[PDB]
């Protein structure tokens, strides 16, 4: 099966702008396509609703079923100031969402 791509369980676009975030310690990239995963996974049985609802009230970060989440991610090579007044070119893993899927 193919991952799904969406716009304005699917992959939605989202551009991170570090300069707008106030993080000038990152020289490059100032902006990059990062994206995210959102959407439906399984047919929801009516009987499952209170479980889903009670879990959210216990912890909104909790999961009691399938999660729409990245299935493929990519790194980015970034250029940034470190803590010793040096500048580093570092490969930062899992910065870009390439594909979304249900766990």
């Amino acid at each position: 099966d193919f991952g799904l791509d969406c716009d304005e369980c699917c992959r939605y676009p989202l551009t991170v702008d570090f300069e707008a975030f106030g993080w000038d310690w990152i020289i490059a990239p100032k902006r990059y396509k990062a994206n995210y995963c959102s959407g439906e996974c399984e047919f929801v049985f009516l009987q499952k609703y209170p479980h889903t609802h009670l879990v959210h009230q216990a912890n909104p970060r909790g999961s009691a079923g399938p999660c729409c989440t990245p299935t493929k991610m990519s790194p980015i090579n970034m250029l940034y100031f470190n803590g010793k007044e040096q500048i580093i070119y570092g490969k930062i893993p899992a910065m870009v969402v390439d594909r979304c899927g249900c766990s």
Partner: antibody
Amino acid sequence: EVQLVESGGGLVKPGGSLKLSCAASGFTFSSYAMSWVRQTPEKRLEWVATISSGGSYTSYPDSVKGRFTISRDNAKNTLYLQMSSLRSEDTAMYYCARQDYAMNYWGQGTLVTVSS
Amino acid sequence: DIEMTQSHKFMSTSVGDRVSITCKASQDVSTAVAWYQQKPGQSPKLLLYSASYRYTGVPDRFTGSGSGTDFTFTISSVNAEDLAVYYCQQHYSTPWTFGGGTKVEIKR
């Protein structure tokens, strides 16, 4: 058009000080990290200093660290290079450039000569 | 400090020919290499960064390759205006360092 214009270069005695300026136009200056790079009389290119877009972070090679200070005034669209304890080997054409992964839109330079 | 070596200080070409300029880093610098073009009486201009990425507005005839220590800058088909000194630079770790440059001349 993106343009960088350096000034303030000249003849200075060893041990002396000089402040270089770089006037930025045709882009959002506050959104760019900036750098100084020099070209020696032998045509050798040497990185001098880099400053973050907001001005908080700076980096220098050990050759100038403690003698040179890079700074900026975003309201004035100007980059500076304050040089002190000047040495003979600091003689060069000084260029300011925008900094991304690499240096771009280098100005035409300002010449600094260190001699008695 | 990282040393960048451009073994050829001078290269002679004819218009329409392919020119390849090599750059060697003294340490692994991943893909963190830029290439600049300097024409007489002008400041250097950025052509490539991160070894193969063309800077905005750079012609298609300019390409770059390499990863680790060995890097190559290529002009697919030399044009008369390509008479310049080409420099490599590592942007891997400070202090940033440049190659000694390669001057490209045209045959007549």
